[PDB]
Amino acid sequence: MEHYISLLVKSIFIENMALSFFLGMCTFLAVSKKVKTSFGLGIAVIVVLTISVPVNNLVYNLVLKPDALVEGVDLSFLNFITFIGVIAALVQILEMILDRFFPPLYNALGIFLPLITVNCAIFGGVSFMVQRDYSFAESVVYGFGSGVGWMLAIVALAGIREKMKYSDVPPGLRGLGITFITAGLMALGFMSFSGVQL
Amino acid sequence: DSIKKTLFVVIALSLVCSIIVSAAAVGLRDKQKENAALDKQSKILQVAGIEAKGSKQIVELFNKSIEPRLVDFNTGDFVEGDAANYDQRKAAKEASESIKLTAEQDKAKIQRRANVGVVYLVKDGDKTSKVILPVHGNGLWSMMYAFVAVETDGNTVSGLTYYEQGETPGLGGEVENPAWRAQWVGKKLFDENHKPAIKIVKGGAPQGSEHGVDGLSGATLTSNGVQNTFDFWLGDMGFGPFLTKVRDGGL
Amino acid sequence: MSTIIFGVVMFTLIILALVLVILFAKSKLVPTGDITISINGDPEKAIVTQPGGKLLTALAGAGVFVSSACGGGGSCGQCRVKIKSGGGDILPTELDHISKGEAREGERLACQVAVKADMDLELPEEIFGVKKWECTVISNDNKATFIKELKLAIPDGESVPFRAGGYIQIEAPAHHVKYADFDVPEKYRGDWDKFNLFRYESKVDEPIIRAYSMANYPEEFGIIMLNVRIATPPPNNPNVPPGQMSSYIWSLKAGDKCTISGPFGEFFAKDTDAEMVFIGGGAGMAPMRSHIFDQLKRLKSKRKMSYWYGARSKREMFYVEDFDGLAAENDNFVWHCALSDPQPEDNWTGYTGFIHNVLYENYLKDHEAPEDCEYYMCGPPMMNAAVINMLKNLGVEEENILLDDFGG
Amino acid sequence: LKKSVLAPVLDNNPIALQVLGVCSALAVTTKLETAFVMTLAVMFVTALSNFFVSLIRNHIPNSVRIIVQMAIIASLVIVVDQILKAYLYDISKQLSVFVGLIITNCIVMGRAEAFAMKSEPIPSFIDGIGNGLGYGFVLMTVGFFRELLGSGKLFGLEVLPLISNGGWYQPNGLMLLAPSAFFLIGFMIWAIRTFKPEQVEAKE
Amino acid sequence: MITIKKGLDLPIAGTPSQVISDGKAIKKVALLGEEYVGMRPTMHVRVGDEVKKAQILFEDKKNPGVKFTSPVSGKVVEINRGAKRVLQSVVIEVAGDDQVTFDKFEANQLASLNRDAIKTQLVESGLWTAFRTRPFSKVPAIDSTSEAIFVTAMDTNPLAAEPTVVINEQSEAFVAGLDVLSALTTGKVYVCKKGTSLPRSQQPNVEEHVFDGPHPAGLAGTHMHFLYPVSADHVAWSINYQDVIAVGQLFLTGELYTQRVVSLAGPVVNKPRLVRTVMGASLEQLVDSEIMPGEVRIISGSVLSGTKATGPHAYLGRYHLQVSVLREGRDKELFGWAMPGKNKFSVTRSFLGHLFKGQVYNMTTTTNGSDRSMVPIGNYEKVMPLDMEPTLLLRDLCAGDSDSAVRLGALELDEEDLALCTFVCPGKYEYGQLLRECLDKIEKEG
Amino acid sequence: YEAAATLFYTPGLVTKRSSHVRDSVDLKRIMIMVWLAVFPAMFWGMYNAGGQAIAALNHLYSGDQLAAIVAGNWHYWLTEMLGGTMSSDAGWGSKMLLGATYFLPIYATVFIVGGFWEVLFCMVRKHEVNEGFFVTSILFALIVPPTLPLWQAALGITFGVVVAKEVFGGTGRNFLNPALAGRAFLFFAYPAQISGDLVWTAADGYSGATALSQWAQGGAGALINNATGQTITWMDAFIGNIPGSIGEVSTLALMIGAAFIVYMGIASWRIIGGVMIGMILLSTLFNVIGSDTNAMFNMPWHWHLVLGGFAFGMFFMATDPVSASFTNSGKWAYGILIGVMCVLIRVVNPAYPEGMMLAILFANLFAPLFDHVVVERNIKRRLARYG
Ligand SMILES: Cc1cc2nc3c(=O)[nH]c(=O)nc-3n(C[C@H](O)[C@H](O)[C@H](O)COP(=O)(O)OP(=O)(O)OC[C@H]3O[C@@H](n4cnc5c(N)ncnc54)[C@H](O)[C@@H]3O)c2cc1C
Ligand SMILES: CCCCCCCCCCCCO[C@@H]1O[C@H](CO)[C@@H](O[C@H]2O[C@H](CO)[C@@H](O)[C@H](O)[C@H]2O)[C@H](O)[C@H]1O
Ligand SMILES: Cc1cc2nc3c(=O)[nH]c(=O)nc-3n(C[C@H](O)[C@H](O)[C@H](O)CO)c2cc1C
Ligand code: FES
Ligand code: FES
């Protein structure tokens, strides 16, 4: 159980997707105005990663790995299209399921799936799972921890941006520039976990 | 009707894109592998002291002067196998050709060791004048890889190079420094009792020593990693028996 | 080459499997069912249509259409409907136009409502009779240099049921009109020849709809009189396309056939005993004349009234005979006109300058309680802003200032 | 004419006005060579995907539109990746993940969905070239600053002699880390909206 | 019962002597137009018109039916209007003693009256302006109703009078007013007071609650927070003890009762006391020959929530029951921000004045500093007894955010409920103005 | 000077509105009271810097080789010129001179370069020059090693003032600690002038470690003063006879100043108690579970306190009002997170010997989240009609 807790806490803190690898920085900087919307988006991202990374692990190990389907062929030049198609299809079917069967959950979190349908966060998570060569349980834990870390970072940025209702920002910086500077200071703060090897 | 048109569009686009992609990807495999080999070939040529400019010159000089081999670490002797295409990282990650180093043996913090290691012999004709050993260990931020070119005496070093380090570019990333790497030519590895003797001295090594190398300034935690790297790869668990064989002769 | 074919087949099968799975999950998770929108709680007569669609479009196709002027976009904000159980959200574009006070009562602009489930409405009763007509232009004479007083006749001599201040909508099919056919008399030909508007020509390729305020008070039966200004390109940007609906209305001549659609209205007069102060200008003479003639002939009210009209010159004044007749017959009504810059040909002996300054100096500067009378106003936006500023600096509330800006 | 190409540089900038396309700007701008290669790759992909999606815009069914567009874009990016690995191997290693992340890059998909779907073949290529020009402008500015102040080099040429090789300059460490790109793009947005004050956002 | 822990009893020199001594005869009164929240007047009298007592002077445009009648009989002498012709005061030169007389009742008949009859008599007399809703602190519409009527039979403002010393004279009128309020309430009537005894109403609707502690506690907002929390769905009315006395006198004798017992006191008052005066009197004539010489500032009400009395506003307010006179501080002191303060007051402990317990200060009207930004050191929590987050609410008011202020509890407050937060601010902020702007926004839009 | 006349005299202003009587405290007095509380720490830091420098100098060089070393460094020959001595028998005055020749130039550089940006921003935006930069400047000047190059101090104060504070609005408008954001700039940008064994004792050619680096290597048996050859005891680290950043060294003096600024109600005992609670809990957990190859696993709670900049940041930099939480219940969590993260970076992070600027800079991002949690628990109480 020590090998799975280390991966979880590492993916949450030591390697944050939004503040270390910077995956999904347009939705991050754009939807960080309210903590309610940020919370809903973080929940949607958690769900999408948790569903998408293990499925792609299975598909890769079954079809796209070298010498996996025929002893002597390498079908790894289809990783990109396979991963992106699987992600898009899963997101759309999840949206339709949540719409028809559970409108209570649809209004809650299923509204943010159109934004993260094709997002760099999930594709980078899958592309990192492929490099790390995880097992199925490690893929599940990595996806979940990465989603939780992304949610934490975006909720923190939203809280800071709500605290900044009292600020007095120069007109040329109001909007995008001060958000970029804020995210830079947030990354500078998150650099505490640099030397930790977990 | 509608479904038929969607299916037709999807299938036609998919066939076109698949022809194009699978034609582009399979026609460049050999060139991609050649490019992937060129990097390590050029680094080895740089360690060996052979000056080579141009990819064709690199390939020619490597195929002429260098000779890769395979070495068993326990017995310390050559083995029969495909040496030019050996992947030591995969061999160490695979549970068939790798042993798990306990905490008392893992001086370098690598946690695994491939049973068969690859070495290179710098030849000029038939006589062998050097041998390039790939050693590696853990430093403060990342695992560091090196090439140490020891002479046929088994003790004297002729050069050294860190080709994959990943540490702070001005404190501990000075393992790639020319003035620090020039401190290794002439250094001996073993004492008279045939024990590891390389020492990374904190504070500066005495002028004109035999086993003394200056430590990195402001970086004692990457210097400790270099010292541990050599403590492992010069002991019984690494290139100890093979270096003993080389010292006895026959290289 | 044995991996090229394998990769091609694998790509094809992956993409086809994904597309088929998406289509199958689509065919099992969409309703494709009807929706019974009931416009009122009581009647059984409801509207059964397809789910995918907009509420305003569905209601218009059904036969109960609200006064949608901007034809989609929320620019005018007039597709106001009241839902008691329907789309559970207020899209921000509508949340602007609908304050917290009305949004709580379930009101919403019909344009950006999303029809996805059974919804029920509560509409007012003045929308049910909104039937169209097939009118015949009697005359399109020129009463001002830039204003054509159009007069329409309703077939079967049926006077439309409306209130003083309402506004019809006029439809115009795709057509082309040149400024060569516009009839202006030698009295107004001066500025036309000076500016060379006769070079202009319109271009409309889609049926359009606009709103126009009636200039006749209800007791004048069987007529729809308008005061239409020309929407000529500004004197700064002459390359911009010209006024579509204005050019079409000016192209209308005597005897032609035009279609008007339903009586509307929100700019109405309050029923109190307080003094009334009308401040009209430019093309805003239609609602002002409607209000004044209504209050003076249909109701025979005794409230103290006053009319204050602005004009660029003595050639811009019209309806002056009617207003002099009213002021001569009644003691309540008293009106005054003011020219911005007169000409020596007019021999003007009267008030000059802007109408806000004229009203302030002559009437409001010495008036006892400037805050106790009601102020009705319609004209150019500059005049609107100036008069509102003057009234707010004299200390008048927004509840008494009841203006109508002709589309901003 | 060329207004459609030269607008996104300063007038309607992707990274500076419509937040689309930030991750690669933050990641690959540590070195001007990688920044330039990524600029060229994004121009290539955006232009060709716009052209092809506009060519087949009328037959794409709305039910599986996303799959078709992502298939075209992924094919383009896979071809570009297999060409980078064969001819620029030292830069592909440094661009490893963000070479493939061009698929989920927002500029490509946004210009495919918004403009290419409702426009002409040739002007779609032009819009792709313009968006790539703006994106590369931002990339190359940030990369110039970071590579000149963090290592003293430009494209691999020592402009400022470092203090190891007997020089006067001691390089900055933040210009090789995370927050420097954020700070540089924020001050770039400041300097842009100081000269084009029509982009300044509303107060409240 | 309820013991308030956080607050501040302000030590200021000149505490009055609770002995009611008659006051100087007044010659002018006035109704201050700018003190009724959200009121736009329709004047009924013109300069030079002879009026009677309880005769209408103006009505409300934004509150149809509510009439603002005259406190005394005389002759309208001035109608002071300011910027944008905003009404400031309707002065009346006292002459004659004519009045408008209403219907009489007895003690037995007062508790079983009808709400409609009570409303007609109150509105026609002009005592309807003694009530104040929550939120927005406006006069209740003549057609509304509220399940909670709060009587404020305690006063804890600095230098304020003692409610007991006044009620022990008009016990009968007080009980009759409580009976009338119990017939009008439709819910209950909350007589919030101190530990001491008071005349008692026998009705089961009337309830006496006891509050203890420093002063954020003589306010009706504390009472509402602790007994009947208000929102947009639940509104509660508010009235003080002398207005209950006036209501009882109206419904017992027929004629309007316009007497007051204010507490004229302050640091620069020669002899502080309680001066029996008239309703709406003139402060310039009420305070003359009773103040130390110098440059002083007369205030209608306490020094925390009170109006400066200058020019057209130099008359006793409607909801104000005390006058506070204190000097004007305009002298610049060298290194005054650094001198160890043995004579300076603070809720912090960075001065030497807190070590001397029971010390009293001759305070003036200085802001002991300049206008800065809010660095929150936690002074607002020391003087906020309610169940809110003080600094976050205050920052949502300064920021200009109305929705978040309403969420954090701005619909439960009045301008007097932030007087101590204005007091203890290092940045010299004034939160009553910000709260009033937020409430105007909320009331207007929505 | 009219611009300088705002500091001497009170404004002499009256109240125009609601509360006609105001409190006596202002922001000027608050900032000057916080500025006067770091004076014992500053003076002991000067004394300690001088004493450590003289001891380390007399360790290596002695005889005619001290002459060539004190004649080659302007600090040394300026001390000897003004009157002090550099021999081993130097008194307490000759050591405070030598520490002042290091602190005063750094303080002057920081003050001037930061005041330039302060004045420029407050002049472009048409405001009065706001105090509260005195605290930032003096804290930045005392959390730095004795041997910074002055250009790096200028760059650091520029980054701390402009980017962290003045680009958001100024005093009371930011969300991050300006002094610890200017030192994080200098720590991660120029990492060898603010780390290692050669930057903390100002003796030319003396290399030695500090006690949170000698503990990480050998534990309590490795704590030793190489310049004198004696064991660093607990009362040495408590009083402050140890090398380190200029003012961080004297826990006694920091306690003396913090007791004053906490009595006056300026600093938050809730934040201080939260920091202490978190530190004690995590340090005791690590002591309990233990480790064989890590020597920082057995450092108790009373050694974490007297070593590094724990007491300088627990007392003066954690209690920053603008960057802390705004709720009484959020301040506890703020302090607890600060202490936990400090102990964590000390123990389980191998590259950084301490972690207090990085623990506070982390908690500065999550303070508003604790505020949000508390206020959202409060808002639900109000809807239930009980608040
Ligand atoms: C309730 C109501 C009542 C009204 N009553 C009257 C009435 O009694 N009489 C009356 O005359 N009007 C009235 N109006 C105004 C009504 O909108 C008129 O139709 C108006 O004159 C616009 O006419 P139009 O459709 O021809 O102009 P449009 O064709 O809609 O607009 C053309 C105008 O806009 C400019 N323009 C057009 N395209 C562009 C472009 N691309 N860029 C820049 N500028 C451009 C042109 O220069 C010209 O000025 C009323 C409006 C409302 C809402
Ligand atoms: C601000 C004043 C209030 C502070 C109050 C004191 C709080 C103390 C709470 C913890 C109490 C126990 O105190 C803690 O015990 C541990 C072991 O558990 C002791 O620790 C000691 O023994 C352990 C046993 O393994 C060793 O590993 C360790 O190296 C050694 O220091 C310390 O003495 C102290 O760190
Ligand atoms: C108790 C107290 C502690 C403070 N601590 C700091 C600090 O650590 N760093 C700093 O730059 N300013 C500090 N200040 C000054 C001020 O709070 C700082 O400028 C704010 O961060 C405003 O930006 C402090 C002020 C007070 C009253
Ligand atoms: S359609 Fe007229 S407002 Fe939307
Ligand atoms: S969202 Fe545009 S690049 Fe990740």
Residue numbers in the entry:
A (entry chain E): 1 to 198
B (entry chain C): 6 to 256
C (entry chain F): 1 to 408
D (entry chain D): 7 to 210
E (entry chain A): 1 to 446
F (entry chain B): 27 to 413
Question: Could you give the paper's own sentences about this structure?
Answer:
The Na+-pumping NADH-ubiquinone (UQ) oxidoreductase (Na+-NQR) couples electron transfer from NADH to UQ with Na+-pumping, generating an electrochemical Na+ gradient across the inner bacterial membrane, which is critical for energy-consuming reactions such as rotation of the flagellar motor, ion homeostasis, and uptake of nutrients. Na+-NQR is the first enzyme in the respiratory chain of many pathogenic bacteria such as Vibrio cholerae, Vibrio alginolyticus, and Haemophilus influenzae. This enzyme is an intrinsic membrane protein complex composed of six subunits (NqrA–F), encoded by the nqr operon, with a total molecular mass about 200 kDa, and contains at least five redox cofactors (FAD, a 2Fe-2S cluster, two covalently bound FMNs, and riboflavin). Since Na+-NQR is exclusively found in prokaryotes and is structurally unrelated to mitochondrial H+-pumping NADH-UQ oxidoreductase (respiratory complex I), it is a promising target for highly selective antibiotics.
However, the density map of the region in the cytoplasmic NqrF subunit, facing the membrane-embedded subunits (NqrE and NqrD), was relatively weak and blurry compared to other parts of the enzyme. To obtain the structure of the cytoplasmic domain of NqrF, focused 3D classification without angular alignment, following local refinement on the NqrA and NqrB subunits was carried out. The focus 3D classification resulted in 10 classes; we selected the three, in which NqrF was clearly observed. As a result, we obtained high-resolution structures of states 1, 2, and 3 from 82,790, 80,882, and 72,234 particles, respectively, at 3.1-Å resolution. Atomic models of the cytoplasmic domain of NqrF of the three states were built from the resulting density maps. Figure 1A and B show the density map and the atomic model of Na+-NQR, respectively, taking state 1 as a representative. The atomic models for three states are almost identical except for the flexible cytoplasmic domain of NqrF. The positive patch in NqrA, formed by Arg40, Lys61, Lys62, Lys84, and Arg85, interacts with the negative patch in NqrF, formed by Glu368, Glu371, Asp372, Glu397, and Glu399. In addition, negative tips of NqrA (Glu443 and Glu445) are in close proximity to positive tips of NqrF (Lys100 and Arg104). The final high-quality density map allowed us to build an essentially complete model of all six subunits containing 1894 residues (98% of the total), except for the disordered N-terminal region (Gly2 − Leu26) of NqrB.
